[PDB]
Structures are given as structure tokens and as C-alpha cells.
Amino acid sequence: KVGGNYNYLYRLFRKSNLKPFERDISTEIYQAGNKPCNGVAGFNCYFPLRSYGFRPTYGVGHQPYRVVVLSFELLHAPATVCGPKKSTNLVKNKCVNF
Amino acid sequence: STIEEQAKTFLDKFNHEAEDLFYQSSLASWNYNTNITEENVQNMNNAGDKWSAFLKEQSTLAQMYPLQEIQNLTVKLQLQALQQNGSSVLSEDKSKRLNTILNTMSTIYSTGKVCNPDNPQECLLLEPGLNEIMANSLDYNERLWAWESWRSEVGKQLRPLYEEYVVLKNEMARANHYEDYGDYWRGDYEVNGVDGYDYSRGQLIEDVEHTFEEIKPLYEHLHAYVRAKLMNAYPSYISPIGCLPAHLLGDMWGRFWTNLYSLTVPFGQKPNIDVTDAMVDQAWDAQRIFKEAEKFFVSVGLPNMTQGFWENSMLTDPGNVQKAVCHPTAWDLGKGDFRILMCTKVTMDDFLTAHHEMGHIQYDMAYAAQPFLLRNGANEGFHEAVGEIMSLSAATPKHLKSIGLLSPDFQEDNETEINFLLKQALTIVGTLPFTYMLEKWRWMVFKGEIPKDQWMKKWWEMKREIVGVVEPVPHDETYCDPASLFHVSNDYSFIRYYTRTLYQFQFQEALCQAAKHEGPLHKCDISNSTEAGQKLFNMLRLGKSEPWTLALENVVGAKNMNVRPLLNYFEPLFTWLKDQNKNSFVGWSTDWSPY
Amino acid sequence: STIEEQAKTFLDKFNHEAEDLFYQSSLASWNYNTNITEENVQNMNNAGDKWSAFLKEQSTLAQMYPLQEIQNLTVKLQLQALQQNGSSVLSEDKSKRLNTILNTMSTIYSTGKVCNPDNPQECLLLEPGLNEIMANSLDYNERLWAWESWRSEVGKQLRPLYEEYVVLKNEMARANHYEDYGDYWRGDYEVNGVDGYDYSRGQLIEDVEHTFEEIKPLYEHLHAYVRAKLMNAYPSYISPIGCLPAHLLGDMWGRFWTNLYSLTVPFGQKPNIDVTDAMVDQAWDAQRIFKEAEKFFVSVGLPNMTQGFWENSMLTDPGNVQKAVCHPTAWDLGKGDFRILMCTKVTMDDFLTAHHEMGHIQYDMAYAAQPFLLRNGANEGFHEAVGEIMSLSAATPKHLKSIGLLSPDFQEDNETEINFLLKQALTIVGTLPFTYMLEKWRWMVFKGEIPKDQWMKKWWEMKREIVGVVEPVPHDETYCDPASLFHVSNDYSFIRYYTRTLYQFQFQEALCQAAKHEGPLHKCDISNSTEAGQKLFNMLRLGKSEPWTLALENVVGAKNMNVRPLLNYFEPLFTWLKDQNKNSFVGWSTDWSPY
Numbered sequence A: 001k002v003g004g005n006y007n008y009l010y011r012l013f014r015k016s017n018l019k020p021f022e023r024d025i026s027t028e029i030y031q032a033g034n035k036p037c038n039g040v041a042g043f044n045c046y047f048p049l050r051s052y053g054f055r056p057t058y059g060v061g062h063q064p065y066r067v068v069v070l071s072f073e074l075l076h077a078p079a080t081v082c083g084p085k086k087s088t089n090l091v092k093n094k095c096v097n098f
Numbered sequence B, C: 001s002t003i004e005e006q007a008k009t010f011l012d013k014f015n016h017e018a019e020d021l022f023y024q025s026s027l028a029s030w031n032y033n034t035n036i037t038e039e040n041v042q043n044m045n046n047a048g049d050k051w052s053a054f055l056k057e058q059s060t061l062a063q064m065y066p067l068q069e070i071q072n073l074t075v076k077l078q079l080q081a082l083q084q085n086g087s088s089v090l091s092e093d094k095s096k097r098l099n100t101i102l103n104t105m106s107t108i109y110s111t112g113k114v115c116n117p118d119n120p121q122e123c124l125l126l127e128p129g130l131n132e133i134m135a136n137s138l139d140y141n142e143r144l145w146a147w148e149s150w151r152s153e154v155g156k157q158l159r160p161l162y163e164e165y166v167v168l169k170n171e172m173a174r175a176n177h178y179e180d181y182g183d184y185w186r187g188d189y190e191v192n193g194v195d196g197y198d199y200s201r202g203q204l205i206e207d208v209e210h211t212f213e214e215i216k217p218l219y220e221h222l223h224a225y226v227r228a229k230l231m232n233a234y235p236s237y238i239s240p241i242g243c244l245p246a247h248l249l250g251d252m253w254g255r256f257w258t259n260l261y262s263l264t265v266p267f268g269q270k271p272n273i274d275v276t277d278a279m280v281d282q283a284w285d286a287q288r289i290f291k292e293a294e295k296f297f298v299s300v301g302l303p304n305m306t307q308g309f310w311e312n313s314m315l316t317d318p319g320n321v322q323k324a325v326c327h328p329t330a331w332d333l334g335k336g337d338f339r340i341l342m343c344t345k346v347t348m349d350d351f352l353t354a355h356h357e358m359g360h361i362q363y364d365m366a367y368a369a370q371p372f373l374l375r376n377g378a379n380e381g382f383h384e385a386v387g388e389i390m391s392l393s394a395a396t397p398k399h400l401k402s403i404g405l406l407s408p409d410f411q412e413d414n415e416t417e418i419n420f421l422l423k424q425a426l427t428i429v430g431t432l433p434f435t436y437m438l439e440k441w442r443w444m445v446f447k448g449e450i451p452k453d454q455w456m457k458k459w460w461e462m463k464r465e466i467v468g469v470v471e472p473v474p475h476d477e478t479y480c481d482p483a484s485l486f487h488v489s490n491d492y493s494f495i496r497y498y499t500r501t502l503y504q505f506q507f508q509e510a511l512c513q514a515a516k517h518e519g520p521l522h523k524c525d526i527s528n529s530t531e532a533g534q535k536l537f538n539m540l541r542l543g544k545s546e547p548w549t550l551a552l553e554n555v556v557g558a559k560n561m562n563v564r565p566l567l568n569y570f571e572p573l574f575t576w577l578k579d580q581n582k583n584s585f586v587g588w589s590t591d592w593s594p595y
């Protein structure tokens, strides 16, 4: 938006790296110094989440890009999901391959 | 966690918060310059103090780092540009007093109006009328009165304010572990923390003096040539072996000698190379100029502009319905947003200026992958140097005839080359002695080598020896000549115009070798040179993350500033001046005076 | 093979031979302390010279290594502790002369007996009788005579020996590439060979002086409070704005002010928190105390004791049939053998002391995987610091009521907290000025800043300014006050009692943050804190294999010594003292004297 779309947030500081396919929604104050700050915002007490503020006048590298990931895995299942197979007509009075 | 981990964490948050707020201030400033309305002024004011207060509160929190345990050169250079306290070291009374002096100097310089005894209601301000007389009027007594009356009304009023301006700036810099306020300006070129590429602040003074020793032989023959031609235009006032007056340089301050081309023209029978009439015949406009200019940059090996450039930037004035600044300025809002504000007309001057503004954008897009604290050039002269080598490469006769401006049935001659080199010398090398003496004089004022009762005496003494300009009338000590300049009264560094001039020829000489040039330096064209653009892009991409000494070696290959490429550019002009400056005594006598 | 391979081979044989011989000496010393018999004395003598001669012959062979080619920090630190020649650098005559002075000083100090003019056969030695008068007797003239007569008989006899003790120790340290003998004691905290964590010997003097600047405001209000309360107990002898006498501090030397609690008690109506009567009602013994203490250490995250601990160590005196030392001492025989010799009685003092001895064993078992030359703490103060934080964490009212000592129908009040903090201040922070002036005085004696004819003058001058204690009677230059102390005459470092005091609060403040404490520092308990024990165990495991600066960062997080946690502990007491020390002038005048 023209006024800035600050609805999308991202985590910038964390204690350690995330595992594959891990989701963490914790908003605890990141301890960057020596004391845990007792859960307040201050020097060496930074908030993990940061906003984007997308604007239409930004560059190509800064425009928002909706990214979707399609995770696929096979666990020796009956494979219930399957795409479309085929669709043909019905031949009559003639030997064909069905 | 060590102190280095806390510094990197502080910078990661600061870079995210700065780019968001700096874009809002740049966008608010863009709306003000593109449309002068009360709504846009308020948007610039509130966003101005918001960014000013943000930079102050973040700098205060950055002072909690000793900076001596950190060994990372990238983290150290960013904190040095952020932990700088500035004028906040002094007390509350000295802070408001210094800001008050800086405010009244700009108002007096802008709203300064000198009255004339010819008519009580015929007073004119600085920019309109006054500069027209100093440039086009040929009367001796007319431009002499206008030159002295301006400094008589502005210098006498700024002299009591300038005496307090020096003592306040000296005590502010000394509190920041410096020697004087003049050393604070020279601190930009300071390089420390990396062996093999260091550069002390005191070495800059020795560098300018050593390089100026070779500019004098080129300037002495240039000053003697202009003096010989002005004898016919201003007779019975110029001495054959004496200096030149200050009101005959073509400007109020004598910075540029562009106005002297109409009087000191070598060959006035043939006009200069102008493509103004060639553009109106082909139905060109502002859009065609930037398209032809973009084709030049992509031929050297630079990427194309972003999509928002041709859509958001206003390259044509819509008329008298949306007021905008007619001055060409490169706008880098950030986050991939690059705009250019310029009222581009159908004129050859706007064609060369278009490449100047477009060259600065190519520089800004190079270091776009750098942090905000390093999102700048190597120094205050590296930015303007890249923007001017593009205009000189585009002003060549071979480039003009290749794009369709010059007719193919036109071959350059020796007379056109001499007029081209001499015209450029009036604005490129002609301002070097003026810039040299102005900086060296102020450097001694802030340091204390010149007493308060000898400001005007040492100013004219250096003008006679370095530039070779004699004062027309005796001036009392109450006057103040340096305060008459815009860059001096508004607290602006003027040494950036000297280093950029020398760096301009260093880059031109470094690109002609890669382009396989076979002629003079002024005929070189960096067009269609992929190896020249790739070598230049490696330096522009670094920006401020690397010292200027290391960046200069990537293109030029020299670790120290060099003035030799400057002499090679005007080498054909030097041989032509020495052949003509043989009928009179070369040089000037400082003992002579017109009074 | 390089010199590094020969050093590692020498250490592998030395560590194997040392642990075998050191265990025999520790086992022979254990049998001597647990049973005083002529058979055990001989077993300690022959094993004593066996280990002494072994350490000497191995140190001589270690001198063949230049130590400059080796780059391994582990091998270098072990050789520095082994290649130290010591007193063997001097000649044969100076070696026996220095040992003779050290022997006669211990005999005179131990067998010192002062006669009294009241009766020719009523003389008493130092420990019995004399210390009882200086602690319990309230008569002014009685304790004044006992204070002066002791230094008159011991100081006058040790003064000729102390003058030769300094010159011999100075020439011995200077031969070892040091400045003076005072620098040799400060060499323990020296860290070299690793960038980012170095610590020079000269920085220790600046560290103690800088940290002492913040202890004075806390001590000035403490000294003024004790002075105001002693006016009613000793009238017509204490000045309202003057200093305090040396015979009214509760001890012969005034090191601890524990004997002043009975006179300077804030609220004497309510008794202090004592669990002596609570243990005899539940039929407790020495075995139950160590079992309850072991449950405390394992709750924080420390492993359980070995099987040989509860079987070989004697925690109860069998009576007057096998004489043993009643002093609690932690015995680390080596090779997984850890014993504690202490006559633990049914008393609250023995309960806190049990955690002190048990805390040292947990330290020794931590660095058990380290070589013999590194099988020690970080310095001379790191060992006692860990042993005292366990006693303070156990003396909290919350820990006493959780194990069953205090009844659940008892809530602490403000009056009990003030009496607890003030009683601890008489022994923890009350000895800091005495330790500060005693070390700084001797550091100037060995260096040479104090002449021989100004030892007693500079001693009392520093006592008046730093501690604020005025001399009762004028003392001639022939006296020797510092020699009256046990640690000074027996050549024992006394600075270890100052660094340990500051390190005690640094560890307590570092563990309260991990334990998620929500109150004052004196109410913290490290019990049931797994994260606090794991962080502390990472530092105790390193021991001496890592510098004390790096080890301090693992728990506290600071690279330099800090006194701020010391002030936060007595912060409620500081505000209480300032509220009460307002009826008189705070401070002391050094110009005043009772004579």
C-alpha cells in the first residue's frame, strides 16, 4: 500500500537455527547481552520479530513475492492422491484396446 | 557472548530501522521537491525530525561500545560513522549558540541585497542581476563597483559572526580528540585499522601541496594567456608583468572562468561544436535523451535501470502548474528506488548533464548490496568523479557522430580541438588555484597559525602568490572576503572539489588504457568497452566498505593521489600555450597593484 | 623430533610419577592429622622430603627447555609452574639465611608469651586467654594494655628480622626476572600467551584501587554506625568526628568485627536466626548434616560423592583416644580419593562449615580430568570463593525451612534481615579496608617506595586514611605492627582474601539471574537450579588449564574484576545505614588522636 503494508512480520534474531520443517511463533525478547532483561525492551534486549512495510515504489528486489513450497514424501502408503488419468470415447462394433 | 556479537546484533537492527525511516524521509523530500505545497512541506518537517531524532538516539546507544576490542574491519567502519557524537559534545549554551550563527549566516547570504547610489530603489540581490553584470557587462567601472559593494555589505556583517564561528568550531573538534575543525574535514580521507593502506590526516595536506607543484606550470601559462588577451578588452588597467584584478575573472568570486571564453577565445571565426540545432531537427525530447544515454551505459557493461525509474521519476517539467526545483539532483530513496529530478530541455548542456545524473545512479546501484552505514562512495570526491567522466566521454566528437547528432560529413580540425581544451581549462584547471588557497587558508585559521588581526592580509597575500590575482582597492581588516562564498558561510567542505578534479583524470587515464586508445586523452570514449566497465564496476560496488586507497588501486592502480593524468589531458593545450605565451613575460608580480 | 615433542614426553612421565608420590605424601599427611603419633610423624617426614626432592630434581631437568619455541598453551602453562626455580637462584649462604629467618619468625610468633606487671607468674600466650580478653572484656584499660603489650614484645623482636626479610626476598625475586617480591605474589593473576584475555601484573594494583573506590561509601557509613554505637559502651574515649582506637575493634589486629555484634546490635530484643536447638530435638548428628548437605549439591546439578568418601573420611571425633586436628580441612589425596577432616558437632556453625568443606570437594572433583600441574583452581581466590557461596545459599531462611530446620509457622521480618546483613558486614566488607591497606603497604616496601626509617609512620598514616583507625599511644620506630599478623610473619599472601571476597558476590550475582530470583541478593538460593549448576560446573571443570579471566566469563560474563555485585548485596543495608547515620558527621578525621 501507499502508506506501507506492515502486516507481514519476520524473525530477525534467534538463539539458534531452526530445524527443517519447524514452525516457531515465540515472541520472547532475544537476550543479546549478558542479562535476560527480565522480559523488557532495552539495550541488548531486542524484539525478535521485525516488520517489512511493503510499498509499490520499491525495487524489484524489495517487492513482496508470495512463495509456496510443495513438500512431497512417500511413506509406503497406498498413494490415495493421484492426478487425472485419461478421457476417451467408446468405440462400438470394433475390437480395440480397453 | 563477546562485545563483537553485540555489535553485529545492534547493526542488524539499525540497518533494518534506518532503511525504513530513511526511505520515508527521502519520499517526503521527493514530494516536496516535485511539488512545492504546504502539505508536502509538513510531510518533510515531521519526517525530518523523526529521522534526526532516530539517528541521535541510536548514536547514543552506540557509544556504549569501547570499539577497541572489535577486530572486524566491516563492523568497525560502520560504528565509526555512527558513534560520532558531533556537536553534541559541547554544553547546551554552546550548542544553541553555534546553531544560531549557522542560521543567520544563511539568511544574510540569501536575503543579502546591496543598494546603489545611482538610484535609491535600484537594489538587486545576489543570483539575479548581479551575476549577469559580472558575466556579460564589459564596462570596467560597472563590474568594479558591483564586486566591491557586495563584499562591503556582506563581508562587514559576517565578520563579527565569522570570528565567533571559528572559536566555536575549534572547541568542538578538540573535544572530539582532534586538533582543530580543519582536521575534522580532512578526517574523511583518514584510513586506519588495515596495514599497507593507511592514510593519515596530516598526509592529505602534504598530498595537495605536492600535486599542486605540477599544476603551477600549466596554470602560469594559462594565466599569462588570459592576461594577454584581456589587454585589448580592458586597456590602461592591466600590467604586462602584473597580476589580474578580481573583478575581471567573469564571476563575483572568480571561481570559474567560463565567462571569459567570449573574450579570450583563440579562434572566434569558427563556432564551437554544438548539437542544439541538430536535436530539434530530429524531433528529440527529454525521453529520447535518457534513452540514448542509457544505451551508452549498457554498452560499457552496466545493467539497465529499474522499472520504477522510468515511471516514478519526472524528467520533464509539466509547466507552471506543479512547481518543482529545476536543479538536476540524483535521488536515491533506497530499497531499489532510484529517481532523477531534472527539467531536461532540448539543449546540449542538458545532454551532458543527463549523463552526469545517470552516472550517479549507476554508482548508487553498485553498492546497493552494502549496509546503510556503508551505502555511500569512497569519499566526498569519488561520487562526483564518476559522474563527470561520463559527460566528458559523451562530449567527444566521435560519440556525437556515432549516435546521430553530428553529420558524418564533418572531420575535426586542430582549431576546434584547441578551443575545446581551452574552454574546459577555464572551469576544470582554472579553479584549482582558487580551491587550493581557499582550503589552505582556512586550515590555518582553525589551527591558529593566522592571528585574528591578519585574516584579510594573509588572504590577499596567498591570492597574489598562488592564484595571481591582485586586489583592486585596499580593503580594511573589518572586511571578510571568504565569508562571501556560499560554501564557506554555510559550513560546507570545499576540498571535495579539488580531489574530485584530480580523481576525474585518474579514472579517465585508467579507462583509456583498457579501451585500447590510440590518441590524446580528450578523444577517448569508454563506449563499447566491456573490460573498462567491468574494472570500473568492481570499484563502484565496494562503495564505502573499503578504503579509498584500496578502491583507487582497482581502477587506476595507484595507492596515492596523482596529478600526472591531469597534465596529460591538457598536454596538447600546454604545448599550444607555451608557443603563444612567448611575446610577454610569463608569470605575475605580487608587488604590483592597480591602486 | 622438535622441542615440543620432548616437552610432552617429559610431562607424561612427570604426571605419572607425581600423582603416585603426591598420593603417598597426602596419605602420610592424612595419617598424621587423623592420629598424632610418633609413627605417623616419621611417615610424614620421610615422605615429605621424598616429594620435596622429587619436585626439585624434576624442576632442574625442566630448565633445559627454552620455553620460547613451544606454542601449545597447555604445555606452556604446565612448564611455567614447574620450571620456576624459586629461592634456589640465590647462593648457598643466602638460601640458608633466608630459611633461618622464616623458621625463627614462626617460633617467636607461636611461642610468644607476654608477661604482665600485675603478677610475675600470670603470663598468657596468643591464642588462649589473650583473644578472650580482646573479644569479651569491656574494660577500656584492660584491652588497651593487652593490645599494646603484645606488639611491644613481638614487634620489637621481629623488627630486626623483618628488615633482613625484605632485602632477601627482594634480591630473590629480582633474580627471577621480576621487579620485587611484591610482584611475585601478584604473578599468580598474570595471564600471557593468549590474545584477548591477557592480564598484566601491574593491572592488578590498578584493579584493587579502582574497585576500592566504591567500597569506601559503603564502609564510611558502616564505620560511622559502629562509632556511634560504641560511644555508650566506651564513653569519654571516642570523638564524635574522630577515628576509632585499634583496641576497640574486637580483635588483636582488628581483622574481623564479629566480636562487635554484641555491642553494635541494631535490634537486640529479637535473637538471631539459630537452628542449634532445632537439631537436638530431631536427634541429628554429624552423619545427618553431611547427608542433608549432599542433597543440596545434587539438587543444583552436581554428582554424588565417591564410595571412599563416606568410608575413609572421619566426620566425628572418637573422643580423647585418637588425637586429631579439630580444624575443618578439605583433603584431596588424588586418584579419586577425597576426604574431609572435621569434628562436626551439633551446631549451626558446623552446618554452614559443612557446606564449605563439601563445596571444595565438588571443585576438586571437577578438574580431576586435568594434569597434576593444572589440578588446581583458577587462582588463590577462586577456590575459597566457591566454598563460601554454598554456605551463604544454605544460610538463607528459605533453605532452612525447606529441609525441616525452621518451623513453617515463622515468617521473616525486616528487623531480622537488617541484623543478618549487618552481622555479615562485620566479617565480609569490614575486613576489606584492613586487607587493602595491608597489601598496598607491603607492595611499597618490597618495591622501595617506603624507606626503612618510615615503616611505622606510613603504616599508621594509611590506617588513619583508609581504615580510619587511630593509634591509641605513640609507637617508636623500633616497633613492627605488620609482623604481629600470622600471614605476614609466616610469608603468606594476604591479597587472596580480598579477591575472593569480590569474586564471592560475582558468582552469587551470576547464579541468581539463572535461578530466576525475584528478591534481594541475600535471599537467593541456588537450590533446585539445574541451569545454575551446569553453568558453574563448566568453570570448575577447567580449573587451572584456562586463565582466570576466561573462566570468570563463563559464569559471571565479565572479563575484569568487578565490585558492583558486592554493593548490590548490602544495598538494603546501605539504605538502612544512611537513614541512621544522619545524627552525626559521617567520616573520620585523621588529625585527631586520643593521646
Ligand SMILES: *[C@@H]1O[C@H](CO)[C@@H](O)[C@H](O)[C@H]1NC(C)=O
Binding pocket: B008, B072, B073, B074, B075
Ligand atoms: C565481519 O562482519 C561481516 C558482516 O557481518 C561478516 O560477514 C564477517 O564474517 C565478519 N568477519 C569476522 C572475522 O568476524
Ligand SMILES: *[C@@H]1O[C@H](CO)[C@@H](O)[C@H](O)[C@H]1NC(C)=O
Binding pocket: B294, B295, B298, B304, B305
Ligand atoms: C534494459 O533492461 C532490459 C531488461 O532485461 C535489458 O534486456 C536491456 O538490454 C536494457 N537496455 C535497453 C537499451 O533496453
Ligand SMILES: *[C@@H]1O[C@H](CO)[C@@H](O)[C@H](O)[C@H]1NC(C)=O
Binding pocket: B299, B398, B399, B402, B403, B525, B527, B528
Ligand atoms: C559502439 O557501438 C554502437 C553499436 O551500434 C555503434 O553504433 C557505435 O558507433 C560504437 N562506438 C564506437 C566508438 O565504437
Ligand SMILES: *[C@@H]1O[C@H](CO)[C@@H](O)[C@H](O)[C@H]1NC(C)=O
Binding pocket: C008, C072, C073, C074, C075
Ligand atoms: C597441547 O597439549 C595438550 C596436553 O598434552 C594436548 O592435549 C593438546 O592436543 C596439545 N595441543 C597441540 C596443538 O599440540
Ligand SMILES: *[C@@H]1O[C@H](CO)[C@@H](O)[C@H](O)[C@H]1NC(C)=O
Binding pocket: C295, C296, C299, C399, C402, C403, C527, C528
Ligand atoms: C526443591 O523443591 C522441593 C519441592 O518444593 C523441596 O522439597 C526440596 O527441598 C527443594 N530442594 C532443596 C535443595 O531444598
Ligand SMILES: *[C@@H]1O[C@H](CO)[C@@H](O)[C@H](O)[C@H]1NC(C)=O
Binding pocket: C294, C295, C298, C303, C304, C305
Ligand atoms: C549417590 O551416588 C549414586 C551413584 O550412582 C547415585 O545413584 C545416588 O542418586 C546419589 N545419591 C545422592 C543423595 O546424591
Ligand SMILES: [Cl-]
Binding pocket: B246, B253, B481, B482
Ligand atoms: Cl575574494
Ligand SMILES: [Cl-]
Binding pocket: C246, C253, C481, C482
Ligand atoms: Cl596494627
Ligand SMILES: [Zn+2]
Binding pocket: B356, B360, B384, B387
Ligand atoms: Zn553531480
Ligand SMILES: [Zn+2]
Binding pocket: C356, C360, C384, C387
Ligand atoms: Zn575454605
